[PDB]
Design a protein around this ligand. Structure first.
Ligand code: SF4
Ligand code: SF4
Ligand SMILES: [S]
Lengths: 373, 399
């Protein structure tokens, strides 16, 4: 494992190094993808590197010129990084207007970081209407047009189809990983699970697929394991901070499934088949379910979480609530009730990328494990 | 026949009629404040407005109790206070100060903001009622893309389909054209009447008055009764302009633009404080919000009108709105409400006010608040903030 884990550790801890390495070896550019969903397949088809942007543990200073204190933590970090020039090796960024805060960030970005092209994209709420699909195809054609202005050459239809196949292969592999991690929950600690998944954001997907298929082979060689502690499912925007993952392990907790925007939300829904490449991508958005950013008057998110809990005999669900995330805040009461109505206990923990003190999560998770008996 | 009286009666009639429909088994809707009201008016449906009701209860100091009920259910205090008041209302089975019946269907348009999407998702799920969605995607380009126009028109068609089922009636193109003609004239009367302060020194009304009349254009934009109400208001305003009268009290020493909706739980105090310094709001962007102009039977133009409401256009255009309101308003300063509920307006306020100040050369100041949550506003701070703006504006008057 160590050869693989260490490789993934090097790209996650030195993202910028990985980017400068990619541009020099291929002579191609890199494009940043803000949360939650971007059509990475289009960037990949051009032979460029889609790099995931998910903020980071940073204090605020420069960002105070554009945002007041009550913008969500993750977008505060992204803006601060942009202003400090941490993203300057990118030839552009897609900032989808999935919420009020993402929309505002994009508008500020045009002034705050004028040297990095901002590519606009707004997914349709009415994503199951045929009209919604046709609209999203037009948005994707716009994204294609902008990327072609940046790289300097046309992006061929046949290439986008190839990229789509590459990505569906990756999604399948990641789902395979989830199952084998669940069957070896003692070896794959929470910090390990997160590393395997998050690593996909800083390298070509086909290259990450081979690394994970190598890890799956090695784990399957080992015998299945009986979890020695309690199992949980994590749900929210993200939970990748070193501190939070250390607390879980210290209380004998293993993560064996998630509904996190940064993790399983990315690969639980495949891109459908079809003759038209941009149409294929657009219909993927029709098919997303159980996400706070994906329109659904029936709010199936809670029921879907319950299903996963029962499939794997999970002992509890922890809401990893991003500080000041209004979409997740609207969801919380109804999703919590759906889960608790099925006899599954839940916990609320705040995720703040600007903190140097996670004692609340430490004592809450401590009490939650003891409550688990 | 007094305008303020006709207007108050009209507003109360909308609530009364909705309660009567409820009793008789006819469906009642709840709608966002800049939804394409024309569509439901074709079916003679009764539609109410959660934002209007929350502002009303807040002005009667009843919003805090409802917000606290919502927060006890697990809704974070970070969420818009209109949404929290409304969730409290549903949980409480209504309220005392300004009651309204629960909805049988929902009408949601995100041109004002995206929070209404999640807000209405929750109501739909918890009450098990149909949700009609008109998604006006944010305009980064200066103009509305053809793709946006086509998608909005397709959503007009889906809305009509669902409304036929809800109402048990068939869409009537003849009544539809009649509705478009009434709505167009009412939009014109709103923009005209509320723009009178701009080219009138002093202004014929206290600026805060605009937010009372706003309730009318929001909840009855397609009604002929609204036409007559605004014509009467116009007669009174023009009469003032000719006799140098106004509902504003004292000498109009300074003219300003206020950015944002008032803090309703403190509206009386804010009015007294500005007037004490001789300050009046004579420049505003809100006359443009409900103008909503389009030719009869032109669905393309109607889509463009709802898409380009000023909360849904790029930051360049948003800024131009404030700059033009200050200049055309003959203003001496700008005063900014950092509204804790409204993230869309708050998260671009810093850059927007810098640009507006650079272009107009006018001074500005601001204060913290909320349109419905009394915990977010501090009287003493509002007072010193406007006092500071006044000192700057007074020094600049000297030649
Ligand atoms: S979805 Fe939530 S966390 Fe993400 S940008 Fe919007 S408010 Fe922030
Ligand atoms: S106040 Fe702002 S956030 Fe609240 S509903 Fe109105 S527009 Fe949306
Ligand atoms: S996000």
């Amino acid at each position: 494992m160590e050869a693989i884990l260490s490789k993934m550790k090097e790209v996650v801890e030195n993202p910028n190094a990985a980017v400068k390495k990619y541009k020099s070896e291929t002579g191609k550019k890199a494009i940043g993808c803000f949360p939650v969903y971007c059509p990475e397949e289009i960037i990949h088809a051009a032979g460029m590197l889609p790099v995931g942007i998910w903020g980071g543990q940073t204090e605020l200073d420069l960002a105070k010129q554009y945002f007041p204190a009550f913008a969500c933590s993750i977008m505060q970090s992204c803006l601060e990084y942009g202003l400090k020039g941490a993203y300057d090796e990118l030839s552009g960024v897609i900032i989808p207007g999935m919420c009020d805060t993402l929309i505002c960030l994009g508008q500020n970005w045009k002034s705050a970081v004028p040297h990095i092209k901002y590519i606009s994209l707004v997914h349709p709420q009415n994503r199951k209407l045929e009209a919604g699909v046709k609209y999203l195809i037009s948005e994707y054609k716009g994204v294609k047009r902008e990327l072609e202005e940046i790289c300097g050459y046309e992006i061929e239809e046949a290439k986008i189809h190839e990229s789509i196949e590459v990505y569906n292969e990756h999604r399948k592999t990641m789902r395979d990983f989830v199952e084998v991690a669940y069957k070896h929950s003692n070896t794959i600690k929470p910090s390990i699970r997160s590393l395997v998944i998050k690593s996909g954001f800083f390298m070509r997907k086909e290259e990450h697929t081979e690394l994970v298929k190598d890890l799956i082979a090695k784990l399957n060689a080992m015998p299945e394991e009986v979890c020695s502690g309690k199992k949980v499912l994590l749900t929210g925007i993200l939970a990748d901070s070193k501190d939070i993952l250390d607390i879980l392990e210290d209380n004998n907790i293993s993560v064996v499934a998630d509904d996190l925007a940064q993790e399983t939300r990315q690969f639980r829904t495949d891109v459908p088949a079809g003759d038209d490449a941009l149409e294929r991508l657009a219909r993927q958005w029709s098919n997303i379910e159980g996400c706070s950013l994906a329109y659904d008057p029936k709010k199936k998110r809670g029921s879907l979480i319950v299903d996963e809990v029962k499939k794997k005999d999970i002992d509890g669900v922890i809401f990893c609530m991003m500080k000041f995330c209004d979409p997740e805040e609207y969801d919380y009461p109804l999703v919590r009730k759906d889960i608790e109505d099925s006899g599954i206990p839940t916990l609320y923990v705040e995720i703040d990328q600007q903190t140097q003190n996670n004692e609340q999560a430490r004592t809450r998770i401590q009490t939650f494990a003891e409550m688990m008996s | 026949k007094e305008a303020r009286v006709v207007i108050n009666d009209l507003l109360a009639e909308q609530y009364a009629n909705a309660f009567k429909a409820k009793e008789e088994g006819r469906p009642v809707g709840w709608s966002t404040s800049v939804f394409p009201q024309e569509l439901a008016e074709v079916f003679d449906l009764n539609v109410l407005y959660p934002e209007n009701q929350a502002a009303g209860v807040a002005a009667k100091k009843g919003s805090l109790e409802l917000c606290e009920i919502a927060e006890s259910k697990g809704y974070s205090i970070d969420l818009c206070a209109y949404a929290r008041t409304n969730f409290g209302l549903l949980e409480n089975g209504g309220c005392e100060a300004l009651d309204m019946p629960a909805p049988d269907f929902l009408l949601c348009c995100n041109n004002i903001c995206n929070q209404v999407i999640k807000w209405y998702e929750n109501i739909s799920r918890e009450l098990d009622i149909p949700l009609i969605m008109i998604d006006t995607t944010f305009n980064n380009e200066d103009e509305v893309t053809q793709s946006r126009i086509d998608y909005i028109k397709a959503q007009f068609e889906e809305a009509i389909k669902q409304l036929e089922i809800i109402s048990g009636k068939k869409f009537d193109p003849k009544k539809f054209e009649e509705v478009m003609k009434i709505s167009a004239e009412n939009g014109r009367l709103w923009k005209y009447s509320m723009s009178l302060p701009a080219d009138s020194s002093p202004s014929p009304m206290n600026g805060f008055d605009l937010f009372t009349y706003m309730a009318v254009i929001v909840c009855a934009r397609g009604k002929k009764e609204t036409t007559e109400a605004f014509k009467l208001l116009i007669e009174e305003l023009e009469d003032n302009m000719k006799t140098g009268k106004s509902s504003f009290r004292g000498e109009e020493k300074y003219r300003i633009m206020m950015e944002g909706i008032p803090c309703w739980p403190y509206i009386g105090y804010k009015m007294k404080t500005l007037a004490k310094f001789g300050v009046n709001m004579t420049g505003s962007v809100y006359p443009h919000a409900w103008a909503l102009q389009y030719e009869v039977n032109d669905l393309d133009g109607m889509a463009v009108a709802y898409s380009t409401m000023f909360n849904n256009v790029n930051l360049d255009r948003m800024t131009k709105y404030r700059v033009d309101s200050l200049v055309e308003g003959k203003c001496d300063g700008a005063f900014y409400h950092m509204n804790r509920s409204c993230k869309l307006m708050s998260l671009i306020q810093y850059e927007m006010q810098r640009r507006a100040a650079e272009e107009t050369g006018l001074p500005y100041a601001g204060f913290d608040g909320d349109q419905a949550d009394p915990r977010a506003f501090t009287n003493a701070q509002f007072e010193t903030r406007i006092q500071g703006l006044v000192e700057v504006m007074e020094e600049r008057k000297k030649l």
